[PDB]
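User: I'm putting together a teaching handout on how multi-component assemblies are represented. Below are the sequence lines for each component of a complex, exactly as they appear in our records. Could you produce the 3D structure of the whole assembly as structure tokens, so the students can see both representations side by side? Please keep the chain order the same as the input.
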Amino acid sequence: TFALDQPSQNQGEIIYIGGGAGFVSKTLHYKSKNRDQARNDSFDILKQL
RNA sequence: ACGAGAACAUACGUUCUUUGAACCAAGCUUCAACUCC
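Assistant: Of course. Below is the structure of the complete assembly, with chains in the same order as your input.
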């Protein structure tokens, strides 16, 4: 249902169709930002809106 | 009172006949109705 849904079967993969999925789904600068991504996303979204 | 005096370089006549402004050519390419409260 909603617990993890990733590691059971990686077969039958997942795409997001944009029904209000969020900022994280639309943006993509991942590698290799782990916490730099989180703090830059927080500053960008929160400071302007 | 002249190598002189008279004497239209004039008459008739289509700048005309034949002929494609044509030929080849995607209004197309990359594009989430989405984002945050």
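A couple of points students might notice: The longest helix of chain A spans residues 36-48. The two ends of chain A are 33 Å apart (CA to CA).
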